[model samples]
Target chain A: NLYFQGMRDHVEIGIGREARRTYSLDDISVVSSRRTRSSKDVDTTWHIDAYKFDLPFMNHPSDALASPEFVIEMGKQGGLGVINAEGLWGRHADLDEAIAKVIAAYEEGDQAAATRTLQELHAAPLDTELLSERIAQVRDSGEIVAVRVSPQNVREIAPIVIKAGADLLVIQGTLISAEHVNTNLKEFIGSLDVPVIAGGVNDYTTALHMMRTGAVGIIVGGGENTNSLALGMEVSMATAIADVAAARRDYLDETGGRYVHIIADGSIENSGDVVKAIACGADAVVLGSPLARAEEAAGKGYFWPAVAAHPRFPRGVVTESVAAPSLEQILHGPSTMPWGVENFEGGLKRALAKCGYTDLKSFQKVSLHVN
Target chain B: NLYFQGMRDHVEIGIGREARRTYSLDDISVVSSRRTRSSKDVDTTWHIDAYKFDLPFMNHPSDALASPEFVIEMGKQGGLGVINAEGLWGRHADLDEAIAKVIAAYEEGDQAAATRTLQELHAAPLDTELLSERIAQVRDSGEIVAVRVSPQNVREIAPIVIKAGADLLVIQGTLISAEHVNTNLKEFIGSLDVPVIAGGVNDYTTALHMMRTGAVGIIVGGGENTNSLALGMEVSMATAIADVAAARRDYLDETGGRYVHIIADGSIENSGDVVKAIACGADAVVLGSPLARAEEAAGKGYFWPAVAAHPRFPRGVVTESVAAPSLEQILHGPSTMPWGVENFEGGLKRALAKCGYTDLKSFQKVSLHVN
Candidate 1:
């Protein structure tokens, strides 16, 4: 029945008419009631051993945008963590000089000129001592410090980050699988003790595999556009939101009771897309372009993937700069008429409430319309 | 031997090194000594039966950027011919009114809002009489008049365009093959008598096949990077400049003396890329983003594909607005700086001289470095 209804030939004619009818976010609203008969009220303030943050969205590490000082400020602003490990923290010990060089490159040249400078910066070897001192700066601010390294550098670079007081670790790449086949060593997924988040897996099988590896969170999509990378290499390679939602449902069923969060990472260009992504079963969205619109973003007006600066395989271009108000104005509005729809957290809360769900956990079960 | 020399391993490394090694155009300039045998040299000003133009680069029929006035102006400039047979030409007949409405919509709302208006314009049925009148206006200006209709709409639309005194007709789509099989009863190529420029074919067999169908000129890539319509489809495609050049060479070999002009239709982002494209084997580049940068572009600053506005299969998005300058400033310059190196004809001439060739015809045969 499912196959018959879902196939292109089997689709009903009236579906077109129904699809043509548009609905705004205001059409739905959330309803909540508290029950007092429970022995003890459920405490929603979930915390780990050393760090406590309001939400779980961490800034991705990219030297083109995120720097050590910027990361420290972002952490203080109530975000989970930030990563600045593109040689500056992990390889180059002189953190200030490295940041200064990158920041100055943009000021001195054109976009293409700055791109050439970034390429040279990527060629530098990682210095662990400088990475530690940078991480220590964030720790000194009493915020949760985190860093990410690809599977190739995890063994070589992560210990230094942990020694410097990193609370969380994210092992990310454009595409990642739980079982990595490296002829040189054993699997990289099993060795991490920190609440490791690994991803960019789009299918049920890969997401379930990463969840089984004891990862606290699973990332989906590359937080970049289809045009940003080579054709068929990124999220456009996977199913749409409806199909991904089905995959997420199947993964949840496969895991029984083990909770592994699904973080949607791409196609979120505006607040509306963000709402649609969450409605399609994402627990939280790992935003890129939206955050790049923040006044605090290091790249004057441009935003590009951290992987874009890869010496041989640049994934994206440093495109036109976005002009938006402060991050707070963008997310939470005393609005200048619905620009970014206010704070990202407020958008999430409003989306949940409109779906008739009171909390994040309940919102995941909201019914969907395929058309 | 050709395959081995042009293989990925060899050319990738070679081209990378060649890209790194820069030399000024002045270093290898050569002088031409071949005299014009007579003053009455039969004026080799390509006089085809229908339309005569100075250059072969035809604008891709895209409404996001091109309007009737824009096309007319481009023709007046004497370098590029343009088509206005898509949704905008037929459906939105009052040229100035439609353009004004579109610009106002973009000013009043966001990009998504403007795109919705484009979709509506695409859905409106074609008005043949109005289309003919639009064509008449351009033809009356003593410039080449051209119109393009997709393979899907060719039968219904071509007669109208031809009746409007259109000098040349184009049948364009994403991946054009010699034999087109569709449920609709549309003639593929043999049906037309006008000087048809059919295209978007990218390989030797396909290009040769299109040539055999009586097409006067072949559009190589259909403005691939800027106006691609196959992004969401299953096809793994990019503008085939390198492959198409080889196809042109093979075709020249196969047909004793016949030569099909190859217009490189995409992947040209800047002046440097344009220089490299001609060196790679393009007779002339059909530019989009560069033209969109002109102050007179229709979408203000945004650009999308002609195919992108198709009612059923939209392929591109209104990405970014280009920095504004008049089209004259773009092509010829007492430019703002050294970077604004204008005079496209001068650049082509210089490129030919440096490569030790006298003209474009001979320059296409110059030696190329693989690795």
Candidate 2:
């Protein structure tokens, strides 16, 4: 009990005294109980509103994995692919050339230059028709078409994509709150034409406020990149997800049975993290740099977060790489890696079976150790 | 109440169940209350036995900073420098040539080769005579001479170093238990002529167990390297130090008079972390990679944990560095940098002055927030 039960205080010359404490995901571990189940019997299937998914994953929207081709592939493999509506393809017709230029700028010892390239590419004026056509193509492919619009841009970008038949609209940002997100939030969410998913909230009260706008689901974090820690802001992904889940529970109780999904989007790195996120009460997870290991990924092994393109303060960078397998093999595999970074499905199944839980929902009831 | 009062449970296929929650340092932040103080009167002095350090800091024992000359310099700077009795010096007399060979191996494509060299170097039976003479040289230099020995080698190593007039003995490990480590522990501890500090304990029961054995201090954690996060274990340093402080409080109350120091040794990356560690209840902190910025530091630019030398199952590696000022500028700075990694003391003074605290012990009584 004392291991996790500790506290301390601090005072300053002028700032005065204060008190609070929170935890990071790694410091938490899922503890298996006295029951085991067959891996084949476990189901990771999860979804929101009208859509259903066989795997509890959402590709984090980025230029790297937001290609229409990758989106189709990801959807076919039972995961939802979120396309960034404002990414280069919508503005630059030469998609491949644009991505290559960004990567080149990164390798050229000009990372801020890479972001400048993104600004230049994005600044080229959104050819709204091209994004609509791209959205239409994924829709034609019969895959679950998810489009993300930054909160500020949603007023201008949301209708075009909705008309293009996007099945879900994600209103996302680094640190989002209630005053002005999801504007048509209540009207559109209740309209039932396309369910809205919004967020990136870390605390209970804020999450509850977001849910009041009638969002079908919530996103927990997208703030961190390689440079996130030094900037003095980071999310303890596990705690953030759990705290939001608690908010979800309160909303469920208040609304008398309306269920809202919690989607984890923080510093989740491996299959082990996927398992922990679900155990921490997330219905699904958004894969960030982890998707770099898919050959179909457009980053060409380089990974960056959404905030990498902030014209003023680029909070992300192209930092790492990995030689990868096909999207299918990465999603579900019979593989040759010791760490669980690959064969995501196999790893999650084993974790579920090992923990004797048969699905993501029940897995949340699993015990944990903070050792 | 819900801020820190939430709990969850988990179960598994065969591994059994564990019920615990985890927290990280990033998940925490120190909050300023309605009070203020001036740094002009702040006191950071702390000690073990009769040797009071002007700064509550100990240079974590590492070959990188273990040379007698560096130790003397560190002592003159108001910090304690620990020498590794079993490190490169006693085993390989010509330390530069040996280090160069290892660095050459590292630069040449053999990444783990440095650890191999350390293992091989440590395997060359420890020359106790040379170490004794080395210890005498440091003692004669008029600086506080502290020696570090691993648990298994404590009996064979402790007495020889104590006989050489070492003022302090550290029985340290990545993870250590007082009951079985080093010897019939208490008998070994009570026989101490010099104050014996033992640890790397994280929980209340284990810390209490260690203090009951009559140790002068307890170290919370010191196992990780920068790349250690990929190995999947990390300490939320602030929460960890606070948790250990809680253990110290209970142990102090239970013993009625005895006080065991809680020395923070994990996840403290910069000067801000140093102030936070002491503010969160640590009496002192052991500097690890933070010292790498110094020109005289032996690691060159590379940083690694002492555990990298395990012949069978080493849990660390060499990675990470920074471009910065010298040792003196680093610890006590008149600075040109914004990152608190430099000018540690100046940063601490500003943090203390900002937070309304005037001394380390009273500072612990300040407020905190894990953001």
Candidate 3:
């Protein structure tokens, strides 16, 4: 009765202060049940399924942050690869030089100038051939190649991404749901296949619906954690994970036995928050701020959302330097502190291990206490 | 050398992620210490120059969030009263009904629809007499009434606000600084008195410059913890308190002895972050999300920034519902949990006491351990 009463008050009052009253997501911690095994006993080798990933964390394919070489390096770092199939890959032949130029612009100017340049670069049309060539190169290297295209382009570009050896295709946008209502086209997820992971969904129903569409993983958020510029609109396109996690859980129950992974895509400012996200119920995270911190980030110390450069309503801007750890440090072991190891896989393992959980599934059930 | 090397790597790599960094004001705390026990304290209190508030946090001026009755309730709860002088006061004369109608809109339809209606209502021009009457009513209740006006309207609205018996005037914008480069006006801060607090400055030089402009307090950061919106053509505005705190300290050294209060204005979504902010160098915080949690909040669980209604570039949105908690519980004891006392002031004090410090000033001297 009290819980129902609280829910009623929540709906009436709109959960403004009350949601945070007795507890916060931070108060929760994933409890891990350890099954200790030697490093040799552990199979660090990832199963190369149709989705193609050396490690689970894949960059959301936004031109503002991802590049061909960046994806190559991410592959080299033992992570899944991503390319903006609808960006320079589809429009520009000399993407490496173009990416360099974009990086240069951000480096030479103030934040406003950098954002403007990012907006301009994002406005370029996608090139199908260049995208295919880039994806071919990564796939040829025996690396798991993936590409991202927005829901608006899913029908038009999905085939191209698949043709380019893109094992995993992400249908991303500011906010997406399984049942898309648009006059221009039918629902987005209904016809899509090729192991699609569509979202930026913020609620349970949407997350569950996307999972039902045969998406093995659902991206819980999108864009740089700092700010987003899609078309002419400036929006903060993060904070969808907590909502999506609820959906992911519900979908897990709704499907009777099926489970879809929840990938937190934004608001990952540091390793602690990253770990906290897992504690809050995330399987993996699609990162921009951390990737932007990489030495090879497209915009130097500045990064923008692919949508920010849309010719109409840019939703975000290119945010300037926020320090990040190295790509290797961000994902692997030999950590220098008590916080989650910065290594991608190592961080995941450490977070799971610290909570005494041996695997991602069990880690989701960890206990939480309000601090 | 290692520290400098790390700093260089941090800057060069452009991975703005630092493990865990913190800061606080030094000399200003000393000054606050001296002033609290001095004759000036008694003189200022007797002259009504120093009106101590029951709670340090103040609601940001947004029509979608704060209405006249909401301000009255918040003030009664001992929170500093903030009236959006630009909203119903200067615009709608039938304030009470309008306020109730806005609440009803959220209750009856989609929350987004309510937000749109709230924005439409705020789009109306300010009514000076009505604005004055509203402030007078709040002041009449024996609360320290505060009012906020953008730098663009300060000159036109200050007279009415002063006449309304407003004790504090907050001149705020998304990315404000001590020195504004406006073409229409010379300096916005030069003419204002009445313990004026101007800003949203993110770095050192700007914080210092605002202090030199004779502001009693400098607000560091924008109101975008929940919503992300850009200021001007390209400036992404948000809290860079770590950046501003460093600047505030540098300014203290530059000014020799002059002190200016620093208020962290964004990224304070919960009590812990609020405590962490003060530990990092903030006298108090200017809150939007926290206040939006109160049962009486105007938007009925949906909150937006004041600039969200700006015709050209609305920087914020009515994004998510704030979790619920009563104003009394949010600021006082009987917290029911260890996640800091449920009370706002209690949270601040307990955080201070936990860090082994007693007053706000001493809290500013707390140490940081970065991973």
Candidate with top TM-score is: 2
Q: Which candidate has the highest lDDT of all?
A: 2
Expressed as tens digits, the lDDT of each residue in A22-78 for candidate 1 is 122233222333232221221112233345455435566665446656566566655
lDDT of 2 by residue, A64-149 (tens): 77788888889999999889998786888878888899889888856777878876776688898988888898899999989999
* Candidate 3: docking tier: incorrect
Number of clashing residue pairs, candidate 3: 71
**Chain B alone, model 2: TM-score?**
0.91
DockQ of each: 0.02, 0.05, 0.02
| Candidate numbers sorted by DockQ from highest down | 2, 1, 3
Q: Please give the TM-score for the first chain of candidate 2.
A: 0.92
When sorted by lDDT, best at the front, the candidate numbers are 2, 3, 1
What candidate 2 gets wrong by more than 4 Å, as runs, is A1-27, A30-371, B1-19, B181-183, B226-232
Residue A198 lDDT (model 2): 88
TM-score for candidate 2, please give it.
0.54
